Design a protein around this ligand. Structure first.
Ligand SMILES: Nc1nc2c(ncn2[C@@H]2O[C@H](COP(=O)(O)OP(=O)(O)O)[C@@H](O)[C@H]2O)c(=O)[nH]1
Lengths: 48, 426
């Protein structure tokens, strides 16, 4: 009688293979708006 | 860790366990010279459940060979997978019980039981401590029901909380070999009902009907019949040796199947079982594994389960398979065979999946189930007992060896009320 080869493997070692890690390098870049003027004067300095 | 001490007694026990250790060695990659082949990690991480290191790399079984005549012990050693056993685990008799429960239990089974309590305690205390004992023997012959029955007795008070698996073959209704059939049955069922945690029922014609109507094998040998039982009794303990998604041991099988501690008699099935010419024509998935599962021809118990009621059933599934295919198939066979299952236990059915299948098969499943349809064996052995007890037939062989007949009526009492308790649950 022959010895049949053992084929046997569990759910852990079939499903939980070491997975490829996600490729994450993405920051949230924000652009600062340029500054707005102080063209502002007071009545004393514009009339007197 | 967990360790199962296999005990086998009598000619039929030794022959049926030669096929048992044949399939366990094959499943675990064990050369009959003890060494290992098969280069798989899943083979050997749970090998102490049935084997032991023997400082030579080889694995000797934890098997206690027992017979009271040296006939078949020479044949089991001379056969294939026969040199795997330790010679000291054999115990040799010289007279042999001549199909006599009396002298096999009282007058000459007493001197050999001291030399075999040396070896069952040697295997028990050699490890850290064990899980259970499985005993394979006959209840129709003399050396099985006389000698192994008493071994079952004193291993209770030395290890009370340990599980006791036991596979027993029974006297047959139609053919009657070993002409004193019911005396060796009734006297040992008394012992077995109060000194066994769980017992599994095998019949010779039930094996012959499997070999004829399902396997279509014209010439059945005793090794062929032993292969069927041995394949069944490896499936009941798959999860002890292999992992799975849902694991279960002998204690899981016990606590779910016995609700009342005195009735522990089970029916055994095994699937798949194809013809050699019908293997390639038949599909292999859980809906047809479970529909061959509940068939009267499929059992190795010669009682029609439609005549009774399924008190509790369980299935040791094996192989990679969908968990909810198993779930849907148990629930379907309950609510469709509604009259076949008892009402007062909701969802009578238990399941366990052992991820690694047996060799050459993608999937398999093994039945262990308490049924009240075993009652028609208990009264069939009973009225065959009292038909020839009333006439004082063959009593002089028993009462002369040390027996008195006060345990003959009170075995009839302690078996007719097994019939009584199994009656009202259908
Ligand atoms: N299952 C099984 N039954 C057997 C085998 N050999 C014999 N028998 C049955 O056992 C009965 C005789 O049993 P016996 O040899 O007296 O059992 P003993 O007490 O162990 O000696 C016969 O009716 C056979 O049908 C076998 O290899 N397997």
């Amino acid at each position: 009688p022959p010895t049949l080869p053992f084929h046997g493997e569990s759910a852990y070692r079939t499903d939980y293979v070491p997975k490829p890690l996600p490729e994450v390098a993405k920051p949230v870049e924000v652009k600062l708006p340029p500054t707005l003027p102080f063209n502002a004067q007071s009545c004393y300095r514009s009339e007197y | 860790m967990r360790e199962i001490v296999h005990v086998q007694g009598g000619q039929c026990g030794n022959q049926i366990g030669a096929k048992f250790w044949e399939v366990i060695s094959d499943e675990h990659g064990i050369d009959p010279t003890g060494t290992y082949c098969g280069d798989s990690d899943l083979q050997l991480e749970r090998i102490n459940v049935f084997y032991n290191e023997a400082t030579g790399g080889r694995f000797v079984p934890r098997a206690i060979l027992m017979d009271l005549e040296p006939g078949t012990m020479d044949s089991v050693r001379a056969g294939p997978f026969g040199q795997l056993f330790r010679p000291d685990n054999f115990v040799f008799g010289q007279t042999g019980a001549g199909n006599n429960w009396a002298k096999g239990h009282y007058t000459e089974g007493a001197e050999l039981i001291d030399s075999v309590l040396d070896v069952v305690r040697k295997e028990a205390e050699g490890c850290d401590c064990l899980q259970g004992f499985q005993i394979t023997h006959s209840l129709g012959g003399g050396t099985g029901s006389g000698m192994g029955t008493l071994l079952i007795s004193k291993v209770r008070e030395e290890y009370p909380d340990r599980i006791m698996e036991t596979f027993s073959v029974f006297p047959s209704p139609k053919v009657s070999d070993t002409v004193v059939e019911p005396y060796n049955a009734t006297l040992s069922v008394h012992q077995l009902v109060e000194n066994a945690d769980e017992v599994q029922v095998i019949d010779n014609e039930a094996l012959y009907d499997i070999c004829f109507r399902t396997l279509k094998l014209t010439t059945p040998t005793y090794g062929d019949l032993n292969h069927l039982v041995s394949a069944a009794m490896s499936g009941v303990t798959c999860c002890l040796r292999f992992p799975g998604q849902l694991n279960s041991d002998l204690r899981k099988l016990a606590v779910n199947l016995i609700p009342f501690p005195r009735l522990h008699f089970f029916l055994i099935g095994f699937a798949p079982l194809t013809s050699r010419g019908s293997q390639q024509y038949r599909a292999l998935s859980v809906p047809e594994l479970t529909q061959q599962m509940f068939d009267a021809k499929n059992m190795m118990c010669a009682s029609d389960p439609r005549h009774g009621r399924y008190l509790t059933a369980s299935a040791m599934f094996r192989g990679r398979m969908s968990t909810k295919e198993v779930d849907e198939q148990m629930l379907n066979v309950q609510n469709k065979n509604s009259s076949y299952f008892v009402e007062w236990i909701p969802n009578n059915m238990k399941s366990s999946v052992c991820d690694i299948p047996p060799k050459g098969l993608k999937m398999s499943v093994t039945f262990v189930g308490n049924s009240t349809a075993i009652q028609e064996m208990f009264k069939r052995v009973s009225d065959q007992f009292t038909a020839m007890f009333r006439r004082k037939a063959f009593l002089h062989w028993y009462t002369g060896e040390g027996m008195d007949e006060m345990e003959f009526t009170e075995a009839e009492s302690n078996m007719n009320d097994l019939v009584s308790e199994y009656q009202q649950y259908q």
